[PDB]
């Protein structure tokens, strides 16, 4: 009934594996670049957190034919997690005790518009192709991955906006907790395209007044934050039952000692804080050790960061933990943010440092009195927490602690 993380895999804007990520994290390296695609589409935001990798040919033809970018990123991330966990094919394939729970925030808007343009084109149905469904559907990530990896256990996608892959992890923990699975791969992926980004721009949610300086467009907790920078990528962690991981001598990053999942039920687009307070308290219940580091949701938005800060204050009071918003470096990978920021927290827990919250040239007045780390700091971490909030008032909180 105790769940541990035994394998990591990440393809993000600051690294194509956990080593490259570890280097970017220690150095405060931004992953945000200028996007000619976002400018050509007619958007105001011309910056994004792209994946610096040419995935062309990296996956077998009969597998990638069904995949969008969200499935490609998550497939690459699961391959890393499988090798990092030390799982041989006979150890996890064709195993009813082995499942997979990975989702995306919104499928694949690109291939969805492609099929519509193809359907309305000169060729019509002839130009659509038989693979648009698996790419565009919301469960494309879990479905495109469970088939080649021969997953026999649990298999579905969870969707909850930017809490997506965080809820995947918590749901994977629950499957372990009630004995239904020994291993669940949890994570997610998100494509990066104008078809998806321009719809956030139409709401005024994207950073638009830093296109000439992309590496400081995402500036969480800075007084002059303009909105979030959209990002893509994927991530996958190996959630395993404790004694099952001990019996096979696996490497154990941390134990999932807490998982919160609540809802605001108030507003659709702006958080309320009350839900996040319950979500954090829910994830800290029964955790005897204090929280050393908190990877906040911090999205570099005017209203988003102050509400979570108020929630952090009410939860911890005066004994506020070390806070850092990695989204200032990575951007917002939406559906993939929960798993990626859990991986960042695990790297910080495993290697004993705290990644900095960059681009804070002027700390927001509503952030004083907190321990917001702005310079890379070596520190022996024992318990870390990561928040993930999504549209509709949905909240997710993960607490991870070192073993023994």
């Amino acid at each position: 009934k105790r769940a541990v993380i035994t394998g990591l895999g990440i393809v993000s804007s600051i690294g194509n594996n956990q080593q490259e990520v570890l280097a970017s994290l220690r150095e405060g390296r931004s992953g945000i670049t200028f996007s000619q695609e976002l400018k050509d589409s007619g958007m105001r935001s011309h910056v994004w957190g792209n994946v610096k990798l040419d995935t062309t040919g990296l996956i077998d033809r009969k597998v990638v034919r069904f995949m969008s970018d969200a499935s490609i990123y998550a497939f690459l991330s699961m391959e890393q997690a499988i090798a990092d966990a030390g799982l041989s094919p006979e150890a996890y394939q064709n195993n009813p005790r082995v499942g997979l729970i990975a989702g995306s925030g919104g499928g694949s808007p690109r291939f969805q518009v492609f099929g519509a343009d193809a359907m309305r084109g000169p060729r019509g149905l002839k130009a659509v192709g038989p693979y648009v469904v698996t790419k565009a559907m919301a469960s494309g990530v879990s479905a495109c991955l469970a088939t080649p990896f021969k997953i026999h256990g649990v298999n579905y996608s969870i969707s909850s906006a930017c809490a997506t892959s965080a809820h995947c992890i918590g749901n994977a923990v629950e499957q372990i907790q009630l004995g239904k699975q020994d291993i669940v791969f949890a994570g997610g992926g998100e494509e990066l395209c104008w078809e998806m980004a321009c719809e956030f721009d139409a709401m005024g949610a994207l950073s638009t007044k830093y296109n000439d300086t992309p590496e400081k467009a995402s500036r969480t907790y800075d007084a002059h934050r303009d909105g979030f920078v959209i990002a893509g990528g994927g991530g996958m962690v190996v959630v395993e039952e404790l004694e099952h991981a001990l019996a096979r001598g696996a490497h154990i990053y941390a134990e999932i000692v807490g998982y919160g999942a609540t809802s605001d039920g108030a507003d659709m687009v702006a958080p309320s804080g009350e839900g996040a307070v319950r979500c954090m308290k829910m994830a800290m219940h029964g955790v005897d050790t204090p929280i050393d580091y908190l990877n906040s949701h911090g999205t570099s938005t005017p209203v988003g960061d102050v509400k979570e800060l108020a929630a952090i204050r009410e939860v911890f009071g005066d004994k506020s933990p070390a806070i850092s918003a990695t989204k200032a470096m990575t951007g917002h990978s939406l559906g993939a943010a929960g798993v990626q920021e859990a991986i960042y927290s695990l790297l910080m827990l495993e290697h004993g440092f705290i990644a900095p919250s960059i681009n804070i040239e002027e700390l927001d007045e509503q952030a004083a009195g907190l321990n917001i780390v702005t310079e890379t700091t070596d520190r022996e971490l024992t318990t870390v927490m990561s928040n993930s909030f999504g549209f509709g008032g949905t909240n997710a909180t993960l607490v991870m602690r070192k073993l023994k």
Partner: protein, 77 residues
């Protein structure tokens, strides 16, 4: 290049096989490992390289490599 070598280029790339493994008498399913959705995508790439429609029917008779090579030249209606 010749017509035949252009349809073999399509089959080899759409199915992921070497060019000389695409013999004329090779079956898409039995020899080239193609399934259902590979067939639909296969007839699409023929319409893109060349400039003819294949109004179905023919598409269901094309089970081997030679069946495609016959219909790319022995038709054009």
């Amino acid at each position: 290049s010749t017509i035949e070598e252009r349809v073999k280029k399509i089959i080899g790339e759409q199915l992921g096989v070497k060019q000389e493994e695409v013999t004329n008498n090779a079956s898409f399913v039995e020899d080239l490992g193609a399934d259902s959705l590979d067939t639909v995508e296969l007839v699409m790439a023929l319409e893109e390289e060349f400039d003819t429609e294949i109004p179905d029917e023919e598409a269901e008779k094309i089970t081997t490599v030679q069946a495609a090579i016959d219909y790319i030249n022995g038709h054009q209606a």
